[PDB]
Design an enzyme around this catalytic site. Structure first.
Site, mmCIF file in Angstrom:
data_model
loop_
_atom_site.group_PDB
_atom_site.id
_atom_site.type_symbol
_atom_site.label_atom_id
_atom_site.label_comp_id
_atom_site.label_asym_id
_atom_site.label_seq_id
_atom_site.Cartn_x
_atom_site.Cartn_y
_atom_site.Cartn_z
ATOM 1 N N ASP A 35 34.712 45.138 27.487
ATOM 2 C CA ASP A 35 35.251 44.292 29.128
ATOM 3 C C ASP A 35 36.355 43.167 29.186
ATOM 4 O O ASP A 35 35.029 41.875 28.899
ATOM 5 C CB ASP A 35 34.292 44.770 30.517
ATOM 6 C CG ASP A 35 33.825 44.341 31.414
ATOM 7 O OD1 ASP A 35 36.233 43.884 31.527
ATOM 8 O OD2 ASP A 35 33.495 43.799 32.598
ATOM 9 N N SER A 199 52.755 38.377 35.838
ATOM 10 C CA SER A 199 53.924 38.782 35.984
ATOM 11 C C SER A 199 54.833 38.665 36.106
ATOM 12 O O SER A 199 54.903 37.506 37.279
ATOM 13 C CB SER A 199 53.094 40.281 36.154
ATOM 14 O OG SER A 199 54.221 41.298 36.260
HETATM 15 C C1 LIG Z 1 35.625 47.626 38.271
HETATM 16 O O1 LIG Z 1 35.363 46.906 36.736
HETATM 17 C C2 LIG Z 1 34.927 45.898 36.807
HETATM 18 O O2 LIG Z 1 34.428 44.663 36.856
HETATM 19 C C3 LIG Z 1 35.456 45.421 35.307
HETATM 20 N N1 LIG Z 1 36.341 44.237 34.521
HETATM 21 C C4 LIG Z 1 33.644 46.086 35.320
HETATM 22 C C5 LIG Z 1 32.993 47.312 35.311
HETATM 23 C C6 LIG Z 1 33.033 47.554 33.997
HETATM 24 C C7 LIG Z 1 32.663 49.400 33.836
HETATM 25 C C8 LIG Z 1 31.951 49.614 34.898
HETATM 26 C C9 LIG Z 1 32.069 48.392 36.445
HETATM 27 C C10 LIG Z 1 32.168 47.221 36.117
#
Ligand SMILES: COC(=O)[C@@H](N)Cc1ccccc1
Length: 330
Positions: A35, A199
């Protein structure tokens, strides 16, 4: 050093991607969601409330000879979709694709929200945003990438996400066979802790390119592409029957449609997202209304170049002293 790991969609829609990660000694392999929009490496564990675990693989620090409690440290995080998790912290050896970091903070969940419990395919998250966003208290911890940096051949990692197919995260090198043409680099602001960039505009289908600055984040942990309402309206206006549904929570379109592509600018370069990448399928099983992959960022507070956008490119996260982001077509 370098590392290279395959990342695999969790389902037929590319809702997220999981990458195997080795934690502890002997190795415990967990499938984590890498992430670039957060900075905590957290896992389901032997400490996670039992009723909140449903099929995930857990990290058991007591079975690792290299695990050590990071005494007094706790963590608690909330994400943009309203999900959350919290717990305590161990240090342990963590390896990704052959690249090993010793003394990595591994955040052990005591509690996770229902969305995490309900997703049996994701054993935790591995954050790759800037370490200034890490939630460990009272001593903030470094990401896997920040810890690895000094050992890496080059202070970079790359995301090469597949469309309905596996892709690759590489650490420490740029695979020049993985993209076509050249990489266009663009400036990053770290002021909010994200891989935040601007962008240079967009086009819908075969339409003319609109030059306009769109500030947003490169976020592998977000499924969709979230852009200003003006841009998103211009896109969906080209799809007969498309509309924003407050009941569903965004733009939907007839499943009989053929979607136009969407182009975004990176400097003078252009990345084209094919129309099929924007189809997230029936809103509920068997429905003839389909969920759109481009949605409004109004109310989020930031534009998000999530997987829908990133998977159309080979993306370089350059963590040199002055960070930058690179995009190439592939
Ligand atoms: C909306 O996604 C986010 O904010 C991602 N950066 C993190 C995330 C991954 C998976 C589940 C929940 C949250």
């Amino acid at each position: 050093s370098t590392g290279s790991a395959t990342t695999t969609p969790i389902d037929s829609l590319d809702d997220a991607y999981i990458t195997p990660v080795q934690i502890g000694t002997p190795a415990q392999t967990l499938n984590l969601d890498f992430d670039t929009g957060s900075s905590d490496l957290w896992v389901f564990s032997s400490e996670t409330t039992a009723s909140e675990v449903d099929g995930q693989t857990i990290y058991t620090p007591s079975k690792s000879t290299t695990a050590k409690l990071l005494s007094g440290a706790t963590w608690s995080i909330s994400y943009g979709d309203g999900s959350s998790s919290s717990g305590d912290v161990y240090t342990d050896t963590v390896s990704v694709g052959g690249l090993t970091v010793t003394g990595q903070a591994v955040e052990s969940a005591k509690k996770v929200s229902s969305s995490f419990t309900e997703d049996s395919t994701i054993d935790g998250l591995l954050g790759l945003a800037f370490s200034t966003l890490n939630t460990v208290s009272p001593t903030q911890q470094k990401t896997f990438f920040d810890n690895a940096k000094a050992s890496l051949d080059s202070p970079v990692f790359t995301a090469d996400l597949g469309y309905h197919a596996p892709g690759t995260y590489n650490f420490g090198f740029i695979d020049t066979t993985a993209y076509t043409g050249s990489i266009t680099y663009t400036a990053v602001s770290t002021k909010q802790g994200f891989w935040e960039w601007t962008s240079t505009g967009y086009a819908v289908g075969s339409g003319t390119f609109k030059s306009t600055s769109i500030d947003g984040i490169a976020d592998t942990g977000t499924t969709l592409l979230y852009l200003p309402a003006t841009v998103v309206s211009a896109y969906w206006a080209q799809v007969s029957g498309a509309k924003s549904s407050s009941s569903v929570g965004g733009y939907v379109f007839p499943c009989s449609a053929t979607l136009p592509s969407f182009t975004f600018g990176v400097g003078s370069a252009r990345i084209v997202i094919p129309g099929d990448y924007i189809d997230f399928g029936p809103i509920s099983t068997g429905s003839s209304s389909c969920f759109g992959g481009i949605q409004s960022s109004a109310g989020i507070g930031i534009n998000i170049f999530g997987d829908v956008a990133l998977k159309a490119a080979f993306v370089v996260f350059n963590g040199a002293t002055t960070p930058t982001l690179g995009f190439a077509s592939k």
